[PDB]
Amino acid sequence: AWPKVQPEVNIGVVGHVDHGKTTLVQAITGIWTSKHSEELKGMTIKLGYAETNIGVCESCKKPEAYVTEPSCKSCGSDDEPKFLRRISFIDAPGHEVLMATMLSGAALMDGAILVVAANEPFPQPQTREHFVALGIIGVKNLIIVQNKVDVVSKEEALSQYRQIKQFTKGTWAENVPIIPVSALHKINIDSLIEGIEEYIKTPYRDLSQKPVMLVIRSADVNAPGTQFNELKGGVIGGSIIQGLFKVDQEIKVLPGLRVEKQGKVSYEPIFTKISSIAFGDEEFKEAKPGGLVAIGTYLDPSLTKADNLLGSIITLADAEVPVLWNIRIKYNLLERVVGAKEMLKVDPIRAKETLMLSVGSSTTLGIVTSVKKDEIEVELRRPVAVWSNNIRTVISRQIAGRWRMIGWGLVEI
Numbered sequence: 379a380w381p382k383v384q385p386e387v388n389i390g391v392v393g394h395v396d397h398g399k400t401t402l403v404q405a406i407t408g409i410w411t412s413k414h415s416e417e418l419k420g421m422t423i424k425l426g427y428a429e430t431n432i433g434v435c436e437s438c439k440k441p442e443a444y445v446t447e448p449s450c451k452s453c454g455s456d457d458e459p460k461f462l463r464r465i466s467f468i469d470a471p472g473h474e475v476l477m478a479t480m481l482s483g484a485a486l487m488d489g490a491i492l493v494v495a496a497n498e499p500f501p502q503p504q505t506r507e508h509f510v511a512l513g514i515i516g517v518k519n520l521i522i523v524q525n526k527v528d529v530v531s532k533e534e535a536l537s538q539y540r541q542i543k544q545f546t547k548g549t550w551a552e553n554v555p556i557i558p559v560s561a562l563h564k565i566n567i568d569s570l571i572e573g574i575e576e577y578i579k580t581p582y583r584d585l586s587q588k589p590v591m592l593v594i595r596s597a598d599v600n601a602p603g604t605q606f607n608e609l610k611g612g613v614i615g616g617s618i619i620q621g622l623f624k625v626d627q628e629i630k631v632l633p634g635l636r637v638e639k640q641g642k643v644s645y646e647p648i649f650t651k652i653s654s655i656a657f658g659d660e661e662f663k664e665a666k667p668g669g670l671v672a673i674g675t676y677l678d679p680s681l682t683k684a685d686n687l688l689g690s691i692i693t694l695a696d697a698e699v700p701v702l703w704n705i706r707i708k709y710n711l712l713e714r715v716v717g718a719k720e721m722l723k724v725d726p727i728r729a730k731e732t733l734m735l736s737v738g739s740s741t742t743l744g745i746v747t748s749v750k751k752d753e754i755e756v757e758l759r760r761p762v763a764v765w766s767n768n769i770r771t772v773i774s775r776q777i778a779g780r781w782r783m784i785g786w787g788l789v790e791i
């Protein structure tokens with residue numbers, strides 16, 4: 379029997395609307411992440427999450443030898459496959475109005491799959507925008523998956539293949555592989571598993587770093603395999619980006635609970651202890667980077683699920699983490715509005731304007747109070763928890779009623 383371990387790597391799945399991201403995750407994991415019959419009142423808005431084990435049948439033909447279940451009967455072997463690792467997928471919504479959600483999920487990714495529909499002109503707006511965001515944030519362990527190849531001839535697929543290679547030529551993604559599949563009919567998925575093992579290696583983890591977990595609200599993610607057992611108290615979900623946490627460790631939620639004392643709005647950190655640690659349906663004594671973890675606490679559930687709880691990160695109780703209402707950012711602007719149907723030119727940052735800041739897994743609006751050539755200073759509508767000095771931020775500006783990614787930078791403390 380394969381061992382029960384936590385997922386050790388997060389693979390993002392991004393791409394233009396309806397290109398088949400959720401169906402590809404289902405092809406790999408067997409899990410349909412988005413309740414898709416109807417949603418709220420015309421797309422999925424939450425992140426999708428699913429996990430799978432990955433194995434390989436030793437004396438069997440590749441790529442068919444790679445498996446996602448402990449069986450080798452498909453290749454004539456009577457042995458169990460060799461367990462390789464457990465992986466997880468962060469499924470981001472494709473709609474252009476939901477870019478903040480993609481950026482929030484991109485903070486959790488160790489690698490990424492860019493889904494490109496073979497029956498659509500390349501590149502579509504969010505194909506370009508999700509690709510640029512990946513390079514901006516540093517998720518450069520990328521596989522480009524040519525989905526829906528069942529719809530088109532081998533000629534048309536190869537034609538689009540050459541377009542993608544020319545698009546990536548001269549960029550950081552020049553050597554990125556392109557793997558054609560049919561997610562819906564599960565064709566050539568084995569070559570994608572092989573590509574994942576070859577191009578999305580599990581990253582080195584510095585397990586001595588100060589433990590930091592980026593929180594994902596329960597209402598912002600669909601994780602069918604994970605469940606909130608809250609007999610001991612509220613459960614907080616998210617992903618560990620550095621260090622490790624253990625059961626019985628004293629922790630704090632930052633910035634914390636909104637409090638208005640005499641008309642003064644502040645955020646009080648919430649302290650608790652880790653009652654339990656869960657990945658999917660299994661309990662663990664420790665939690666490392668990789669996978670969506672469920673941190674069981676002793677807090678009352680009405681607190682952990684409250685909208686007034688600005689729970690952006692979790693750290694150890696005695697960790698030093700500034701919570702800033704004002705931040706300075708060494709920024710860089712793009713050359714063009716990438717996610718629009720027509721690529722506008724981006725105007726420079728001007729004082730007194732409102733910008734959207736993606737920091738870790740949170741999004742915050744703020745007022746520019748100082749503009750320089752390579753630095754800005756922002757008055758934040760809500761504080762952000764800054765656990766390090768080299769923290770990436772993505773800058774967005776509202777254009778035509780839609781927030782569009784215009785630049786990036788580093789939060790300087």
Ligand SMILES: Nc1nc2c(ncn2[C@@H]2O[C@H](COP(=O)(O)OP(=O)(O)CP(=O)(O)O)[C@@H](O)[C@H]2O)c(=O)[nH]1
Binds near residue numbers: 470
């Ligand atoms: N013919 C064919 N259709 C596919 C394939 N993969 C997905 N589709 C179809 O495309 C449609 C959208 O697929 P879905 O996986 O939901 O796309 P999505 O990208 O997750 C939608 P969103 O961008 O809102 O997240 C569905 O009808 C699905 O059946 C494929 O490999 N071949």
Ligand code: NA
Binds near residue numbers: 408447
């Ligand atoms: Na599986």
Ligand code: NA
Binds near residue numbers: 486
């Ligand atoms: Na990362």
Ligand code: NA
Binds near residue numbers: 532
């Ligand atoms: Na084809």
